[PDB]
Design a protein around this nucleic acid. Structure first.
Ligand SMILES: CCC[C@@H]1C[C@@H](C(=O)N[C@@H]([C@H]2O[C@H](SC)[C@H](O)[C@@H](O)[C@H]2O)[C@H](C)Cl)N(C)C1
Ligand SMILES: [Mg+2]
Ligand SMILES: [Mg+2]
Ligand SMILES: [Mg+2]
Ligand SMILES: [Mg+2]
Ligand SMILES: [Mg+2]
Ligand SMILES: [Mg+2]
Ligand SMILES: [Mg+2]
Ligand SMILES: [Mg+2]
Ligand SMILES: [Mg+2]
Ligand SMILES: [Mg+2]
Ligand SMILES: [Mg+2]
Ligand SMILES: [Mg+2]
Ligand SMILES: [Mg+2]
Ligand SMILES: [Mg+2]
Ligand SMILES: [Mg+2]
Ligand SMILES: [Mg+2]
Ligand SMILES: [Mg+2]
Ligand SMILES: [Mg+2]
Ligand SMILES: [Mg+2]
Ligand SMILES: [Mg+2]
Ligand SMILES: [Mg+2]
Ligand SMILES: [Mg+2]
Ligand SMILES: [Mg+2]
Ligand SMILES: [Mg+2]
Ligand SMILES: [Mg+2]
Ligand SMILES: [Mg+2]
Ligand SMILES: [Mg+2]
Ligand SMILES: [Mg+2]
Ligand SMILES: [Mg+2]
Ligand SMILES: [Mg+2]
Ligand SMILES: [Mg+2]
Ligand SMILES: [Mg+2]
Ligand SMILES: [Mg+2]
Ligand SMILES: [Mg+2]
Ligand SMILES: [Mg+2]
Ligand SMILES: [Mg+2]
Lengths: 126, 136, 78, 58, 179
RNA sequence: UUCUCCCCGAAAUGCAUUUAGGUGCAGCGUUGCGUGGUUCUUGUUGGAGGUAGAGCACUGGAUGGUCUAGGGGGCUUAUCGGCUUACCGAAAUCAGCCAAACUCCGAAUGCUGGCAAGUGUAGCGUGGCAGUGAGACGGCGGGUGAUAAGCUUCGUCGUCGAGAGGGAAACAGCCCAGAUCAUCAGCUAAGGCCCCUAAGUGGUGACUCAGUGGGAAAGGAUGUGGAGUUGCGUAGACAACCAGGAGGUUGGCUUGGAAGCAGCCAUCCUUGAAAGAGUGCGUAAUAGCUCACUGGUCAAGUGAUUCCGCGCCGAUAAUGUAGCG
RNA sequence: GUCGCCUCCUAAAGGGUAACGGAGGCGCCCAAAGGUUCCCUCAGCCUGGUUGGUAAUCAGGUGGUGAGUGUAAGUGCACAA
RNA sequence: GUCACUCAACGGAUAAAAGGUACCCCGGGAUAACAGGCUGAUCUUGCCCGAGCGCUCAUAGCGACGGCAUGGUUUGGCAC
RNA sequence: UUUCCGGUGGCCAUAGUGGAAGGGAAACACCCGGUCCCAUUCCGAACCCGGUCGUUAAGCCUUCCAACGCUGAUGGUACUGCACGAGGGAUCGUGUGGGAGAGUAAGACGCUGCCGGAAU
C-alpha cells in the first residue's frame, strides 16, 4: 500500500518522515545489479530489506526481531551494527555484491550509519 | 445600454453564427418568454428597445428579465479608408443569438397582456422570435 | 491614417512527439521536444537541458504513468 | 468468402486522390471494368471507401 | 391514472436509425430499472405526445411478445422549436415502492396591487407513491407583501409525499413593484 | 527566334535576397546508372493530441434570487449609541448563461509505428538537362473587411492553367467525362424526352391557378388543400329576424362638458328568464342608434388555436418584350 | 508604421501555415540567482495578542496549490524546478 | 584561444554618400487619375412596429426607440 | 495453511474528506530522560542518542454510514470523414461510417505484490 499522496491526519513526525522518505526515493531505485537497501528505524528496532524495485520483491532481509538477536547483549547502535553484519552476510549468500542504501526518511547518523558501516565491512560495494 | 464594465480583449473575432442554442433554451426566470427561432447578432440598442417596449406595455406589474448580455465587441474600420493598417476600434456590442434561445422573460402579468407586450418587443429584434409559455 | 502596433511572431520551434508508442529507436534518439516536463523521463529515457526526452538505450517507445507522473519509457527489445 | 464482384460505374476524375488510389488498388482501370475479389475485410473497406464510384455484388 | 402505450422492439441504433424512426412518426425510448437490462423500444409518436402532455405520468409500456411494464418518463428530449418528443427515458417502477419525482410550482395568491409575487423555481424534488402523484404544489400568497420570502420547509404538502431537496432555498418571493 | 513525328510532362510554393515583374538553393518535370516493393490503398492493432462540440473546474464576462461585511442620506441628535438600513452594496451561496488568446472534458478526421492483403509500376540513392518561383475560380475550415465585393490573406480538395467531347441559352475555373486513328454499329454518364432539339403532347396518385413554375426582406392577409389540440351544440349551438337592450348612478382626480366612449381606477349591488359604474357609431356637453345576455318560428353544425404542402401582397429604372434560351 | 530574435492566439487536437491580423516581450541579469548535499512548505482565511491599524512580529486552527518562479508569455514545477 | 560590428535595412552591395526636376529624357493596365465592372458601408428611395404629438383621438398630418429592404445618379471599398 | 498486525512497493479518490464505534499478542506509536555521538538562523519542539515505565488519548489498524467529494453506463443528442441536397442570404438538411460533453440509472467507506512478527 503506497499512495502517492501523503495521507492527512498522520502525526507530525510521521508526516515529516514520509516527506523525507518520498524525497529520498526520488533518486534511489533498486535493480538486480544494485538492489536498494532500505532500513526502517523505529524507536525499538531496525528492519533492513534489500529490494529489487523493478519486481517489487525483497531479496534478503534482517532485523533485531530475529531469534539470535533478541538475547544478544548490546546497545541500540551495537544491535544495528550486528544487523548490518547479518544483512551483509545474507547479501553475500544471495550474491548481491553492491547495493544502493536508502535511509528511509531518516538521517544517515547513529544506528543507520552503524548498520551501513557494518554492511560495508561484510563486503557490500557501497 | 448594456456595456460590460471591462473586457479582456477589445478586438475579437466575429462570434460563430452556426448551430442551435448551446444553453438557455428553457424558461428559468419568468412565466412567459421570447424565444429566438433564428440566429444573429443582437445589439445592445435592440435589446434596450425591446426592453422599453415590454416595460412600457406591462406598466407596473411583474418583472422583466434579459437573458442575453451584449458583451461581444465588434470593431469598425476607419471611415473612407482603404483596407489594412490594423483592426478598427470597437463600435457595437452584441449578443450571439442562436435558434431556441430565450431572449426575454416576463412574469407577474396575465397571458394576453404578456402576449401583446412581447409582440411589441419582438417587433424590435432583427431576427425571428416567438412567444413561449410554461405549457400554460 | 494609422498603423498596426502588432506584427511580431517568433520562428517555428517544431516541438512535439518525434517517436510514438511502439516505435523502434536507437540509443540517443530524441523522443519528444518539449518545454517543461509535460512528459517525464521513464525507464531508459533521459531528459535534456531544454527538457528534450531521448532514448538512453535501444528498444521500443511506450507512453505510460509512473506514480503520478506521465512518463515515456523505452522498453528493451526482446 | 463469397467472391465480391466490384464494377466501376463513375470516373475517377475530380475525386479525392485517396479514392483514385483505392480504385487502382482494386484493379479497376475504366468505368465498367469489373474485378473479382475474395470476401475479406480490406476489400470491403476499399469498396465502402469508394461506394459512390463502384457497385458490388456476390 | 395509467396511460397505456404500445411499443415495439428497437434493434437499429444510431443517428440514422433514430432519424428513420422519427420519420415514421415514432419516438425512440430506453427503459431501464433495477432488476433488468435496459430495453430499447420505439413508441407511437402522437400517443407518446398525448401521454407526455402531463408531467410525471404513470405509463404502462405494452410490448406484444413480453408482459406490460410500469414506468415513469424521467427524461424527455423534445424539439426546442417545435414540440415533438425526440427521445424518452423510461424508469421502470414497482407498485409497492416509492418514487422520486419533480412536482410543479405555481402562485395563486393575490397581494396588494403595487407589490407582485414571483416563483424562483421550476420543479421541486418530492418522494411520493405510484398511484398518488400530485399534479402540482400550490403556494397561496394573499396580502403578504414587502420583503416576505417563502422557503421550501413550510408548504402544505399532500399525504404520502415527503420532502427531499434542501429546505434552505426560496421558491417564492413577494416584493414591491419594479423600480 | 524558322521542318516533322514518337514517349514523358510541370510551376505559379518554401527559404534568402539593395529583394519583391530579377535571382540562388529547395520543392515539382525529364533522363542515364544503381537498389527492388522499400511507395500507395484498405483493413486491423497501438501512440501523442486539445480543434469541433460541450462545460463552468480555473481566468475573465454576465442575468436574477437569498444573505451580508461596508459605504451614502437623514433623524433622538452624534464622544458613543439607538431609530433607520425602505438607497448603494464587495464578497458567500442557489438558478440560467458567455469566451480566438478560458478548460473538470473531449471527438470525427489527420499524423505516425507494427502486421495482413491488394496494387499502378510506385518509392529511394546518385549523375546530365531543365522550366517554374504574376496564378484563377469552385466546395469545405478560417483571419482582414460591414454577416460586402468576381475583395484580400491562409489550410485542404477539385478543375482551368496546360483539357478537346457532352450538359449548363451563350458562358477558362460548375456537372459528367480525360480525345492513338477509322467506323453511315451498340450501351450509357451528367442532363433530358410538346416544338425549336434526339428521346414520353408516358402510366398512376396528389397539389398549384400565382404564368407560381420562370429572382428577394422585415412584415401583412377569411387564398387554397391536409393533419392535430381545444370551447359551445337537437337539455339546441353561431348568424338573421321579433320584445327586456336599463335602475341608485350626471360613482370618482379632472375638464365652462367626461352623465357611456379624455385617461387612470377599488373594476358592485338591483325589478329579476336579463345586462358590463360602459365595448363601437353619435358626439359644443347631455340625448340616442345599436353590442355581450334572456324567450319565440326555424335550425345542422359553428368558434378559437397549433402545425404542414403549394400559392398572394410587399416588388421598385432608364435603346426594346427583356428575371423559362 | 515596419525590418533580427523570443512567447501566446489566428493555426482547422502531429509539424508547418499568410495579411500594414490580435496581444506582449528581448538586444539582459546573477560569483550567486551556477554545482552538489541536506532540510522546509506556501498564498488566502479565522481566532488570540503592546506599540501595531486590513496589512511589520508572535501563537493555535484551517488551507494543497489560488503563493512563488531574476525578466514577456506559454509549458512546467508542491516529489518541488 | 580570444578580441574588434544598433554591419538593427540584424544572410551582413562601399572603408566611405543627401536632395530637386513643371526643362526633363529612355516598360506596366503587374499600379493610380476618367469612364465601365463588382460591392453597397455611405448616399438615396421606400417600408415594418407604433411611444408619443395632434383639445379628445396611435395612424387627417405625424412618427421616438428599434427593425427590413430598393435603387446604383453621391463619397468610398476592390483593382477586373 | 490461515487470521491479525508491522514495514516496503504498484494502481494513484471506486482509494479521498467527514462521522460513529471498537482494538492492541509480537510490532508500531505516543511517552520518559539528555550523560554520551548529534542539533536548533532561539527552543532535546524538531534532528540525534539511552530506555520501554506508563497509555491506547492521538497516529496506526478493524468495522459501519453515500453524507460531501470521486467513478459512471445503455439510449438519445451535438459534432464529424466521405457522398449529396436546400435557401436571396446568415445558414440548414439527408445518405453512409465514426460519435462526445452534459445528464440519468448506477458503483463506491479501496484493490494488490514482497519481507517480517505472533498465534495457528
Ligand atoms: C483622366 C483622364 C484619363 C485618361 C485620358 C485618356 C488619354 O490618354 N487622353 C489623351 C488624348 O490625347 C489626344 S486629345 C488631347 C488624343 O487625340 C486622344 O485620342 C487621347 O489620346 C490625352 C492624355 Cl488628353 N486616357 C485614355 C485615359
Ligand atoms: Mg447549463
Ligand atoms: Mg539544465
Ligand atoms: Mg542553458
Ligand atoms: Mg501523359
Ligand atoms: Mg518573384
Ligand atoms: Mg531553380
Ligand atoms: Mg466552440
Ligand atoms: Mg509569388
Ligand atoms: Mg494562393
Ligand atoms: Mg480558394
Ligand atoms: Mg480574386
Ligand atoms: Mg487540365
Ligand atoms: Mg471543357
Ligand atoms: Mg452549346
Ligand atoms: Mg487517353
Ligand atoms: Mg438506349
Ligand atoms: Mg441519369
Ligand atoms: Mg423529335
Ligand atoms: Mg396528356
Ligand atoms: Mg405528362
Ligand atoms: Mg416569375
Ligand atoms: Mg417572396
Ligand atoms: Mg431552357
Ligand atoms: Mg498544431
Ligand atoms: Mg491539423
Ligand atoms: Mg504561405
Ligand atoms: Mg535580411
Ligand atoms: Mg561592406
Ligand atoms: Mg516614354
Ligand atoms: Mg488590372
Ligand atoms: Mg472606378
Ligand atoms: Mg469599357
Ligand atoms: Mg488581385
Ligand atoms: Mg456520466
Ligand atoms: Mg452514446
Ligand atoms: Mg458520455
Amino acid at each position: 500500500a503506497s499512495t502517492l499522496t501523503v495521507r492527512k491526519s498522520l502525526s507530525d513526525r510521521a508526516k515529516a518522515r514520509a516527506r523525507r522518505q518520498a524525497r529520498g526515493r526520488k533518486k534511489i531505485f533498486g535493480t538486480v545489479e544494485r538492489p536498494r537497501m532500505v532500513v526502517t528505524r523505529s524507536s525499538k528496532h531496525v528492519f533492513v530489506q534489500v529490494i529489487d524495485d523493478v519486481a517489487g520483491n525483497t531479496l534478503v532481509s534482517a532485523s533485531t526481531m530475529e531469534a539470535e538477536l533478541r538475547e544478544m547483549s548490546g546497545d541500540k547502535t551495537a544491535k544495528a551494527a550486528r544487523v548490518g553484519t547479518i544483512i551483509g552476510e545474507r547479501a553475500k549468500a544471495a550474491g548481491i555484491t553492491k547495493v544502493v542504501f536508502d535511509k528511509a526518511g531518516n538521517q544517515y547518523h547513529g544506528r543507520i550509519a552503524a548498520l551501513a558501516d557494518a554492511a560495508r565491512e561484510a563486503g557490500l560495494d557501497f | 445600454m448594456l456595456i460590460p464594465r471591462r473586457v479582456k480583449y477589445r478586438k475579437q473575432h466575429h462570434p460563430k453564427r452556426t448551430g442551435a442554442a448551446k444553453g438557455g433554451t428553457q424558461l428559468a426566470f419568468g412565466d412567459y418568454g421570447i424565444q429566438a427561432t433564428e440566429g444573429g447578432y443582437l445589439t445592445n440598442r435592440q435589446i434596450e428597445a425591446a426592453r422599453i417596449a415590454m416595460t412600457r406595455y406591462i406598466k407596473r406589474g411583474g418583472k422583466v428579465w434579459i437573458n442575453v448580455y451584449p458583451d461581444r465587441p465588434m470593431t469598425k474600420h476607419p471611415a473612407e479608408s482603404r483596407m489594412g493598417s490594423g483592426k478598427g476600434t470597437p463600435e457595437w456590442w452584441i449578443a450571439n443569438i442562436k435558434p431556441g434561445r430565450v431572449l426575454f422573460e416576463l412574469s407577474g402579468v396575465p397571458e394576453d397582456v404578456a402576449r401583446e407586450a412581447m409582440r411589441l418587443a419582438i417587433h424590435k429584434l432583427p431576427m425571428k422570435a416567438r412567444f413561449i409559455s410554461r405549457e400554460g | 491614417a494609422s498603423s498596426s502596433r502588432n506584427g511580431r511572431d517568433s520562428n517555428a520551434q517544431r516541438l512535439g512527439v518525434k517517436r510514438f508508442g511502439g516505435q523502434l529507436v536507437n540509443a540517443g534518439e530524441i523522443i519528444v521536444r518539449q518545454r517543461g516536463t509535460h512528459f517525464h523521463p521513464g525507464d531508459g529515457v533521459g531528459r535534456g537541458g531544454d527538457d528534450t526526452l531521448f532514448a538512453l538505450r535501444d528498444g521500443n517507445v511506450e507512453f505510460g504513468t509512473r506514480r503520478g507522473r506521465r512518463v515515456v519509457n523505452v522498453t528493451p527489445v526482446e | 468468402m463469397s467472391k465480391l464482384k466490384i464494377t466501376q460505374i463513375k470516373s475517377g476524375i475530380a475525386t479525392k486522390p485517396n479514392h483514385r488510389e483505392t480504385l487502382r488498388s482494386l484493379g479497376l482501370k475504366r468505368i465498367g471494368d469489373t474485378v473479382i475479389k475474395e470476401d475479406r475485410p480490406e476489400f470491403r473497406g476499399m469498396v465502402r471507401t469508394v461506394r459512390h464510384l463502384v457497385t458490388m455484388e456476390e | 391514472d395509467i396511460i397505456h402505450l404500445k411499443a415495439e422492439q428497437r434493434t437499429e441504433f444510431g443517428k440514422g436509425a433514430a432519424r428513420r424512426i422519427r420519420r415514421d412518426d415514432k419516438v425512440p425510448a430506453v427503459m431501464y430499472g433495477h432488476d433488468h437490462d435496459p430495453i430499447h423500444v420505439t413508441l407511437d409518436g402522437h400517443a407518446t405526445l398525448l401521454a407526455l402532455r402531463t408531467e410525471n405520468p404513470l405509463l404502462s409500456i405494452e410490448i406484444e411478445g413480453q408482459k406490460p411494464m410500469l414506468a415513469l418518463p424521467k427524461d424527455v428530449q423534445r424539439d426546442v422549436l417545435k414540440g415533438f418528443v425526440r427521445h424518452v427515458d423510461l424508469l421502470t417502477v414497482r407498485r409497492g415502492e416509492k418514487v422520486d419525482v419533480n412536482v410543479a410550482l405555481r402562485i395563486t395568491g393575490e397581494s396588494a396591487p403595487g407589490t407582485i409575487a414571483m416563483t424562483e423555481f421550476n420543479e421541486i424534488e418530492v418522494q411520493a407513491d405510484l398511484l398518488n402523484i400530485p399534479e402540482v404544489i400550490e403556494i397561496d400568497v394573499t396580502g403578504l407583501e414587502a420583503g416576505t420570502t417563502i422557503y421550501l420547509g413550510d408548504l402544505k404538502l399532500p399525504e404520502g409525499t415527503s420532502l427531499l431537496g434542501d429546505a434552505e432555498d426560496v421558491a417564492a418571493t413577494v416584493a414591491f413593484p419594479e423600480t
